[PDB]
Symmetry: C6
Subunit: 192 residues, 6 copies
């Protein structure tokens, strides 16, 4: 995918962001967007094609893959990145608006907006982490047993690349936890 527009706006907000905030944005670019592009998308590329079920029943593989993976992991991470970035977009928009007003003519209302955006980032990060956990836990097993119609009885289905997917799941979970910790540091640093 093409993240150029998002990257441009995030670069814009870097100028008006705290040091911790700049660390957060660079982490976002290097350890989330770049990982999905260079590494994860290739891992998940053959998710359905190499999904195999031990049956002669038409449509069983499709329904079972859908049940096993309601939403693909890479897609969920895309959404997580976008929603997490959106508060920064709101903040930079507010700042640019203030600048344009000054042209017509981090304190106070602007500072409060910054803190609010940090809070929203934290909430979205926790929400996506919890959602991933309930969806998949954090370990993808090779065997999925499926009892969804049209499959006759329970059928054994086998996932592609489960170990590598587990590795990247855990990597992204760690990155999200790091980003959350950075946000906590931002709040503490503002407090100081």
């Amino acid at each position: 995918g093409d993240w150029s527009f998002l990257g441009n706006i995030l670069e814009e907000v870097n100028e008006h962001s705290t040091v911790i905030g700049r660390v957060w944005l660079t982490v976002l670019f290097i350890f989330r967007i770049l990982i999905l592009g260079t590494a994860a998308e290739f891992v998940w590329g053959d998710e359905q094609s190499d999904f195999v079920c031990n049956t002669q029943q038409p449509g069983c593989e499709n329904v079972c893959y859908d049940e096993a993976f309601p939403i693909s992991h890479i897609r969920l991470w895309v959404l997580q990145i976008i929603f997490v970035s959106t508060p920064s977009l709101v903040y930079v928009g507010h700042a640019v608006h203030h600048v344009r007003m000054e042209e017509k003519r981090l304190e106070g209302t602007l500072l409060r907006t910054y803190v609010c955006h940090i809070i929203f980032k934290t909430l979205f990060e926790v929400g996506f982490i919890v959602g991933h956990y309930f969806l998949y836990g954090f370990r993808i097993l090779p065997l999925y047993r499926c009892s969804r119609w049209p499959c006759p009885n329970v059928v054994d289905c086998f996932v592609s690349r489960p170990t590598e997917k587990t590795i990247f799941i855990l990597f992204m979970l760690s990155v999200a936890s790091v980003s959350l910790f950075l946000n906590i540091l931002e709040m503490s640093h503002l407090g100081l």
Copy 2:
């Protein structure tokens, strides 16, 4: 797909747009174009290939897929984005024309044009929402029963990734509703 040209023109119109309008354009880029590029196109990539029908009849799968999906969802969203953006293109063109005339030498006629473009955006958004609804509702079921010739009788066909497609359908519907609400806010803000 390459949206660079459209992005450039939309960026141009940002300068001469209202704050709500800038919010609308950023929503368009981040939550529509970027979603289609990064996420949705991969979801719908194997729509026909992994479409499977329980038959030994040649051509049944092709005719049934065509009947089930007259137009693909991602294509309809492309068209929706383009038509929705077109009013902004008209408005920016009018503004640039006025500027060039001033060189030769948001009020009045220009303001009325802006409001008209907002109205067109609202109409196109509602039209595409209603069209999608009548075409597909908002839930893609896994089973499609097909009675189209050459299929003998009704045949059971099975869709790929129905749950994920439902998730993205609903996501895009929400984004469109948000954009419509933003347009309403634009009109109210102008009224104030």
Copy 3:
């Protein structure tokens, strides 16, 4: 495909073009090039692979697909865009030549050249429309009956995605008609 070079030259000619001409060029970029890139190429991507014929005869599918689609639609639209743009290239080249001569040192000969280029655009547009019509009409049917050797007798062949292709055929026909109408407006506006 990469249209960057053509886009650059067309952007150059925008500066020295009429308001109607700018509308025409933006229509060309947004509703032809962008449609082919984002939407149509994916539609026509699996034209031959998912073309299926009810036979056990080697080579029948290849010969029948070739007979049914002598030239693919997307390719014909590429050619249409290029030939339609070429008059603008001639006009901008003439203008730049005049500028360089002035450096060494829309009226008259330049205006006549502009009108001639409009006429060529109209002729090429009508020609491509008529050619498409005679080749395919404007509705792609799912069933193609083929009697081309090596096929034994008439064989039934089934086209992929006929409905979506019909939708895009009609969309592009509408866009071409709109562009032609714009050219007529250009001539009338010059007359005024």
Copy 4:
């Protein structure tokens, strides 16, 4: 493929080229590079995969495809473009060298070099045209009869998309003839 570097150098030589030369370069970009990228590469994409031979003999299809198409057409056109452009590269290099020498400090030796480069362009164009003609004529037939080992006897093989390939073959031949005529015009214009 990526032609950015070649495009940059050709754009550089446009400044120091004749009006006819600029027409030639724009023809090269729009009607050769852009055609190969947007249209022809997709046509020839499935040349070997959809090549089918009526046999049960392993390796017959590979050897027969190789014999039928020793070099693919698109590849030959790539080479033609590169060799044809190379004289312009030589000329621009000579001009830039002269400029750098003047910094240290179209007539005469430079003009003769320009004419020589035109001559080389004409020779390379004629050579590639004749080579294509002897290789393939100008019509690709659907049926190729192959007697190459390991094929037992003569086997019937069937080419993919022969009509479309014929259309593009003829289109590129016309473009090459146009470019040659332009070179002739360059020489005559210099003579005047």
Copy 5:
């Protein structure tokens, strides 16, 4: 994958880096990123598809490929590049922070930070080398014998392109050793 953002930041740090450091960064770009993009990704492209196991057992190939290659080599090299680059990112961030503070208003604390970043680079490089060694040694054999359920007994599986993969494994190992040696040179040069 797209490394533009990382490349931009690394280019930024080149200005404030030692001569040995610049050599290290150019080695990183030319002999790691460019190798993975141009060469290695194509080698490893068909890792699972052309993985073949001598069995009629569903799911055996998937489980055996996963066991043989828990993480793909190219993915591990991506991670290695990112982690190795991260210290440079920290250093450049610290330097830019100091610059911004000076605006508000290689020695001392900055120099110590530089040395620390060198140490982290060395540790990460050694860690990835050792991890690769324990995972795969440095020779990929063609035969993998697999006893993982559902495979019945030990099954013989055959890897794709083992020799080429061995060649690139050794090439990247050499590059990593060279980079480590460069870091040692950096420390010695600072000592001098």
Copy 6:
């Protein structure tokens, strides 16, 4: 692959290079990088997929393809380009270092470094030529007879596109010889 970074550095070294050196670099870009991108990569794209062996033995095709092509040709050419370019990178780095030192404050040591880099280029070119020759000669035959386990006895395997690959092998060999001759000219010109 993406050669932008290498291209940028090579463009930088053009400014501080001899006329023959500029000819060499343009040859490198136009006749090596552009050929691999536009033409050769498509030729070698289906090397393993269309490799066919006359056997019913699992894994025989993989082992035989690996034995026949230990390293793919396109990969070897990538490595050749990178190693050949590396001396220019060393030279430009040395020159930029001298410039930065002058800021703090082709003759002599710099000239000797330039000659040394030419020598390294010549050695690497000869080495890669000889290596290719011993690996493959310069003609790819269609038939490869393979006796590698698990294949039972000698099996006949058939290569894809052998003639086209031979053509490009010879083309690249010619380009390398031309570059070597250019280096010889560089040394002679310096001698004069």
